[PDB]
């Protein structure tokens, strides 16, 4: 769609751990943000 938002922190593991696959990730305006693996 457009972006990626959270409804919080513990949240956005979800997408990112879809989309990204790597679970290093931050809530940041409601939008997540991966930083990618560890």
Same mark, same amino acid.
């Given at each position: 769609?457009?972006?990626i =938002?959270?409804?919080?922190? +513990?949240?956005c #593991? $979800?997408?990112?751990? #879809? $989309?990204?696959? !790597?679970? /290093? @990730? =931050?809530? $940041? /305006? +409601? @939008?997540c +943000?991966? #930083?990618? !693996?560890?």
């Amino acid at each position: 769609d457009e972006a990626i =938002r959270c409804t919080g922190t +513990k949240d956005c #593991y $979800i997408p990112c751990r #879809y $989309i990204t696959g !790597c679970f /290093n @990730s =931050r809530c $940041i /305006n +409601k @939008s997540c +943000k991966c #930083y990618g !693996c560890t």
